[PDB]
Amino acid sequence: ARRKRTTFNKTQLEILVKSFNKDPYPGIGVREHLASLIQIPESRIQVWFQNRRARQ
Amino acid sequence: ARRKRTTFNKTQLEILVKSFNKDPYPGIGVREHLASLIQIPESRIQVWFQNRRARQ
DNA sequence: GCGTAATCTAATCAACA
DNA sequence: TGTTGATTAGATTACGC
Numbered sequence: 001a002r003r004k005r006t007t008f009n010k011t012q013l014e015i016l017v018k019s020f021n022k023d024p025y026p027g028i029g030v031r032e033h034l035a036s037l038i039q040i041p042e043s044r045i046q047v048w049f050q051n052r053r054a055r056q
Numbered sequence: 057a058r059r060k061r062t063t064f065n066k067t068q069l070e071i072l073v074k075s076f077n078k079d080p081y082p083g084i085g086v087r088e089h090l091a092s093l094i095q096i097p098e099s100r101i102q103v104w105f106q107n108r109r110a111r112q
Numbered sequence: 113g114c115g116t117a118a119t120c121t122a123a124t125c126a127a128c129a
Numbered sequence: 130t131g132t133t134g135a136t137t138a139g140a141t142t143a144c145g146c
Contacts, residue, residue: 006118027058042099104134
């Protein structure tokens with residue numbers, strides 16, 4: 001079975017979109033910073049960035 | 057920009073290889089169980105399983 | 113129901129002994 | 130220098146709202 005679908009609120013999405021507009025390929029440091037900031041596991045943020053680059 | 061390379065000891069590798077021989081496609085439950093068991097983040101275990109299925 | 117999170121493979125890079 | 134963990138680009142499948 002798959003994990004439960006991670007849900008992002010308005011603030012988390014806004015922060016992630018700003019970070020994406022700054023750099024679409026964030027290193028491990030910035031990814032972990034975003035993880036601690038919006039309280040979302042770093043793996044989920046990496047998946048989000050991959051999907052975001054995929055739609056764009 | 058990459059994360060530090062995850063290092064596995066003998067026991068972690070043994071448990072992961074046993075789980076792989078049992079099921080090469082573990083669900084989220086089994087992955088999180090292995091994560092809690094060998095104390096390694098679930099994303100690292102998913103990456104390890106992907107690489108293992110890739111080289112075999 | 114749509115958007116998008118999650119997952120898999122295939123290919124490539126690089127780092128820690 | 131080698132093994133193998135880490136990353137990314139595509140295709141998918143399938144929940145959360």
